[PDB]
Amino acid sequence: HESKQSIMQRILTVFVFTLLIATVGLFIGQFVPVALMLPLSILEVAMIILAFWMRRRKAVGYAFVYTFAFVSGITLFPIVSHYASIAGAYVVLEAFGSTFVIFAVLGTIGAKMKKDLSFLWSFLLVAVLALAVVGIFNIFSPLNSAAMMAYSVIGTIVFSLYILYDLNQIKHRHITEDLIPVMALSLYLDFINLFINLLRFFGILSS
């Protein structure tokens, strides 16, 4: 018989694992010739679209989640290398670092606070759409540095709030073992999409 503690710990474990796997993929992305990479904006919004799309009640397997972690890790290298070529490799750490701590804070706060935050859902969903919208817009009408930067601040706020909300709901809601893969998947999607926004923010800022 599973407890909320065991399910908590398990989702976190799977999550951390997706981080490691995606990291490996990120290492694999550097050995891909530049003639086979996807456009920056396309990937940047792809991550958002996936961040939203994979927020359903359809229980996928650990296989799908880990597979996705690997391939997304691979495909997020062109983003990393870009904001590294314009702002020094150090920023790649910086953003990551920041991301980590944020996830570690709200993720702890929501998972311990007694206020049920269900009422947020709709808004959050809406928020993502807007970002996605702008993202799509960014494909057909590239935004300047300042607008992209404000977009990055917005994205940061949204995905941080989404981290807090997600942990809060993992504790508050009825989550069974079959839901463990899909939960740690979203947790992975928040981390990645927050990191992107921070890397885009500080990467542009230090140019």
Side-chain angles (χ1 to χ4, degrees), residues 123-138:
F123 170 76
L124 284 173
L125 293 176
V126 171
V128 182
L129 311 182
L131 297 180
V133 167
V134 180
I136 299 179
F137 185 79
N138 180 34

Side-chain angles (χ1 to χ4, degrees), residues 129-202:
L129 311 182
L131 297 180
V133 167
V134 180
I136 299 179
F137 185 79
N138 180 34
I139 310 179
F140 293 85
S141 180
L143 314 175
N144 54 48
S145 300
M148 194 65 61
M149 218 165 50
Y151 177 80
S152 291
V153 179
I154 301 305
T156 299
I157 300 178
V158 172
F159 284 106
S160 294
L161 192 52
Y162 236 135
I163 290 167
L164 178 87
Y165 169 81
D166 274 348
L167 266 296
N168 176 267
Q169 292 307 282
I170 286 177
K171 190 197 74 172
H172 269 89
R173 302 283 73 83
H174 184 64
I175 304 298
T176 38
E177 54 181 7
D178 57 330
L179 285 182
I180 295 186
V182 66
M183 292 302 147
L185 177 55
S186 291
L187 293 195
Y188 168 85
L189 286 176
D190 309 337
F191 191 94
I192 288 306
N193 290 261
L194 178 64
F195 167 79
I196 290 182
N197 286 276
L198 294 188
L199 176 66
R200 178 160 61 239
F201 179 84
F202 297 118

Side-chain angles (χ1 to χ4, degrees), residues 20-56 58-89:
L20 283 348
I21 296 174
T23 301
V24 175
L26 175 59
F27 178 80
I28 303 310
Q30 69 176 291
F31 292 96
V32 183
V34 197
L36 290 184
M37 293 180 175
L38 293 318
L40 187 74
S41 58
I42 285 193
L43 302 173
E44 290 171 346
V45 69
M47 291 291 180
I48 303 295
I49 294 174
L50 296 170
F52 172 70
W53 182 251
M54 302 299 179
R55 197 158 308 267
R56 306 172 294 175
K58 173 194 171 183
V60 301
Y62 301 88
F64 179 84
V65 176
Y66 288 161
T67 307
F68 182 83
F70 186 66
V71 299
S72 60
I74 292 189
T75 56
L76 68 86
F77 172 86
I79 308 183
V80 172
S81 70
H82 175 266
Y83 293 103
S85 57
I86 74 174

